[PDB]
Structures are given as C-alpha cells and as structure tokens.
Tab-separated table of C-alpha atoms in Angstrom:
chain	number	residue	atom	x	y	z
A	1	UNK	CA	109.887	98.232	116.401
A	2	UNK	CA	109.249	100.917	113.784
A	3	UNK	CA	105.702	99.558	113.592
A	4	UNK	CA	103.874	100.640	116.748
A	5	UNK	CA	105.545	103.647	118.373
A	6	UNK	CA	107.622	106.343	116.672
A	7	UNK	CA	109.344	108.160	119.536
A	8	UNK	CA	112.072	107.753	122.188
A	9	UNK	CA	111.822	105.664	125.385
A	10	UNK	CA	109.311	107.198	127.775
A	11	UNK	CA	107.046	109.033	125.343
A	12	UNK	CA	104.487	107.251	123.166
A	13	UNK	CA	102.523	108.597	120.199
A	14	UNK	CA	98.759	108.087	120.011
A	15	UNK	CA	97.927	110.572	117.253
A	16	UNK	CA	94.306	110.720	118.408
A	17	UNK	CA	91.607	110.968	115.739
A	18	UNK	CA	90.814	114.571	116.667
A	19	UNK	CA	92.552	117.922	116.204
A	20	UNK	CA	93.220	120.347	119.043
A	21	UNK	CA	96.951	120.011	119.662
A	22	UNK	CA	98.673	116.634	119.986
A	23	UNK	CA	99.257	115.223	123.468
A	24	UNK	CA	101.708	112.625	124.777
A	25	UNK	CA	101.992	110.004	127.517
A	26	UNK	CA	104.764	109.207	129.998
A	27	UNK	CA	105.524	106.759	132.809
A	28	UNK	CA	108.952	107.452	134.304
A	29	UNK	CA	107.278	110.454	135.933
A	30	UNK	CA	103.607	109.462	135.803
A	31	UNK	CA	103.046	112.786	134.042
A	32	UNK	CA	100.949	113.410	130.930
A	33	UNK	CA	102.637	115.706	128.411
A	34	UNK	CA	100.847	117.974	125.939
A	35	UNK	CA	103.533	119.562	123.763
A	36	UNK	CA	106.367	117.447	122.363
A	37	UNK	CA	109.265	115.161	123.379
A	38	UNK	CA	111.814	117.977	123.571
A	39	UNK	CA	115.207	117.582	125.215
A	40	UNK	CA	117.933	117.555	122.572
A	41	UNK	CA	116.347	119.012	119.436
A	42	UNK	CA	113.107	119.539	117.514
A	43	UNK	CA	112.527	116.088	116.024
A	44	UNK	CA	109.296	114.800	114.512
A	45	UNK	CA	106.805	117.380	113.304
A	46	UNK	CA	107.928	118.036	109.737
A	47	UNK	CA	111.066	120.166	109.430
A	48	UNK	CA	113.052	123.015	110.951
A	49	UNK	CA	116.014	121.955	113.075
A	50	UNK	CA	119.519	123.401	113.147
A	51	UNK	CA	120.934	120.875	115.602
A	52	UNK	CA	119.307	117.570	114.561
A	53	UNK	CA	120.571	115.347	117.376
A	54	UNK	CA	117.880	112.759	116.653
A	55	UNK	CA	116.266	111.575	113.418
A	56	UNK	CA	114.555	108.549	111.878
A	57	UNK	CA	117.841	107.657	110.184
A	58	UNK	CA	117.014	104.148	108.971
A	59	UNK	CA	119.164	101.606	107.132
A	60	UNK	CA	117.664	98.887	104.934
A	61	UNK	CA	119.426	95.516	104.867
A	62	UNK	CA	119.310	93.320	101.763
A	63	UNK	CA	120.317	89.743	102.568
A	64	UNK	CA	123.294	88.521	100.538
A	65	UNK	CA	126.576	86.596	100.584
A	66	UNK	CA	127.949	89.588	102.488
A	67	UNK	CA	125.721	88.858	105.483
A	68	UNK	CA	125.498	86.478	108.441
A	69	UNK	CA	123.731	84.002	106.157
A	70	UNK	CA	122.858	84.298	102.441
A	71	UNK	CA	119.239	83.176	102.783
A	72	UNK	CA	116.218	84.648	101.003
A	73	UNK	CA	113.042	85.246	103.007
A	74	UNK	CA	110.995	83.735	100.180
A	75	UNK	CA	113.461	82.317	97.655
A	76	UNK	CA	115.114	80.486	100.550
A	77	UNK	CA	118.329	80.622	98.521
A	78	UNK	CA	120.780	83.394	97.640
A	79	UNK	CA	123.726	82.236	95.533
A	80	UNK	CA	124.345	85.775	94.285
A	81	UNK	CA	126.993	87.958	95.926
A	82	UNK	CA	128.391	91.494	95.993
A	83	UNK	CA	127.905	91.311	92.225
A	84	UNK	CA	124.191	91.858	92.837
A	85	UNK	CA	124.396	93.326	96.340
A	86	UNK	CA	125.350	96.934	95.604
A	87	UNK	CA	123.495	96.653	92.296
A	88	UNK	CA	120.194	95.493	93.791
A	89	UNK	CA	120.259	98.676	95.872
A	90	UNK	CA	120.929	100.900	92.861
A	91	UNK	CA	117.786	99.468	91.297
A	92	UNK	CA	115.633	101.221	93.886
A	93	UNK	CA	118.098	103.889	95.010
A	94	UNK	CA	116.702	105.948	92.135
A	95	UNK	CA	112.964	105.536	92.703
A	96	UNK	CA	112.129	105.530	96.414
A	97	UNK	CA	113.466	109.063	96.866
A	98	UNK	CA	111.622	110.029	93.682
A	99	UNK	CA	108.380	110.430	95.605
A	100	UNK	CA	107.232	107.332	93.735
A	101	UNK	CA	107.836	104.711	96.424
A	102	UNK	CA	107.173	104.962	100.161
A	103	UNK	CA	109.878	103.627	102.479
A	104	UNK	CA	108.393	100.388	103.810
A	105	UNK	CA	107.536	97.997	100.977
A	106	UNK	CA	111.173	97.172	100.229
A	107	UNK	CA	111.554	96.493	103.952
A	108	UNK	CA	108.370	94.416	104.090
A	109	UNK	CA	109.453	92.328	101.103
A	110	UNK	CA	113.254	92.185	101.083
A	111	UNK	CA	114.854	93.486	104.280
A	112	UNK	CA	116.245	90.754	106.531
A	113	UNK	CA	116.880	92.599	109.796
A	114	UNK	CA	114.100	93.861	112.065
A	115	UNK	CA	112.984	96.185	109.268
A	116	UNK	CA	112.023	92.967	107.483
A	117	UNK	CA	108.759	92.534	109.386
A	118	UNK	CA	108.889	95.706	111.480
A	119	UNK	CA	108.390	98.401	108.842
A	120	UNK	CA	111.767	99.752	109.911
A	121	UNK	CA	115.026	98.454	111.365
A	122	UNK	CA	115.056	100.798	114.361
A	123	UNK	CA	113.689	104.233	113.523
A	124	UNK	CA	114.836	107.227	115.555
A	125	UNK	CA	117.203	107.592	118.509
A	126	UNK	CA	118.212	110.197	121.091
A	127	UNK	CA	121.914	110.479	120.264
A	128	UNK	CA	123.464	107.124	119.413
A	129	UNK	CA	122.381	103.553	118.714
A	130	UNK	CA	125.265	101.478	117.358
A	131	UNK	CA	128.006	101.476	114.720
A	132	UNK	CA	129.565	104.929	115.063
A	133	UNK	CA	130.352	105.010	111.317
A	134	UNK	CA	126.636	104.492	110.688
A	135	UNK	CA	125.480	107.748	112.278
A	136	UNK	CA	127.609	109.521	109.669
A	137	UNK	CA	124.757	109.462	107.154
A	138	UNK	CA	121.534	111.136	108.284
A	139	UNK	CA	123.381	114.342	109.167
A	140	UNK	CA	124.519	114.784	105.565
A	141	UNK	CA	121.371	115.518	103.559
A	142	UNK	CA	118.097	117.454	103.517
A	143	UNK	CA	115.542	114.734	104.259
A	144	UNK	CA	114.295	112.350	101.588
A	145	UNK	CA	117.739	112.180	100.000
A	146	UNK	CA	118.901	108.694	100.987
A	147	UNK	CA	122.550	108.293	101.986
A	148	UNK	CA	122.819	105.220	99.782
A	149	UNK	CA	125.762	102.818	100.190
A	150	UNK	CA	127.344	103.900	103.476
A	151	UNK	CA	129.462	100.759	103.809
A	152	UNK	CA	129.730	99.595	107.420
A	153	UNK	CA	130.456	96.514	109.529
A	154	UNK	CA	127.670	94.586	107.801
A	155	UNK	CA	127.673	95.130	104.049
A	156	UNK	CA	125.505	97.759	102.377
A	157	UNK	CA	122.700	99.752	103.997
A	158	UNK	CA	120.549	102.719	102.981
A	159	UNK	CA	119.749	105.684	105.224
A	160	UNK	CA	116.421	106.863	103.811
A	161	UNK	CA	115.528	108.990	106.836
A	162	UNK	CA	111.958	110.166	107.420
A	163	UNK	CA	112.595	113.151	109.689
C-alpha cells in the first residue's frame, strides 16, 4: 500500500511516460477511463477543491511504549516512553513541512505500521477508513501543513497529507 497505486479501489494510476492527457484503467465495468476518478470531489491533480471528501491524509506511527509493543525496527529495543514519544515527533514536525524533507524517509526508517515499509500507512480514501477522530485532521489545513499530534486510539500520529 502507498507504494504501488495511489487511487481508490477500481481505478489504477499508470502515469505513462508520455504527455497527451492522462488515462485510467478499470475492471468493475471493464471500461477504460480517460479523465479522472471523479465521484465525490476533485482529488489528486494538485489543488482546487471546495468539498475535499477524499485526500492522502496520512498518519506516521513512531513505535514506543505507547504502542502494541515497544520494539525498534533496527535497535530492537525501545525502553523510552511518552517522554520521547511526543518529543521525537517535534524533532521533525518542524522540518518535513519546511520543504526540506519529503514525506517518506521517516516512514521508511522509523514508522512501524504499514507506512514502515510501504512508503505510507494507507494513503487516500473515498470517505472513511477507520478511527472517526482521525479523519478530523486533513480537513483542517491547506496542504503541506501537517496536523501534528492528533492523539487517537493508538498514541501519536502525524497527518502530513499530500493532496
């Protein structure tokens, strides 16, 4: 996930190494699209959307004592706790959104969840994915703002958002 495709279920992105309008592929209707996965809003592209009912609202997950198991991907040990949990995030919180750090490295060298080795926990949805209190993040900024510590039924995540 968040490594191969970058769209909802049914439509896949190929990019195609050649200009001339971007096309799409389907399956549920054996029909080839040639416009955009429209249905709820104008996601993807770049910007311009009054009713953003679907975005790449991500949420990094830094393993810690406030998780299912305080185990480091490399260190193999995480004695630290909330004392370095919310802090560890603040260390990057003011750098990634500073156009001086693409959203991926931290996930491919820290994240524990899927984002760990999937360049992204989930990515984008159509309306809802999980934790209701989690969705209350993306729709509260202007892209590339990072929601920061949202505080949910897990510990401490970060909604970077890339759409």
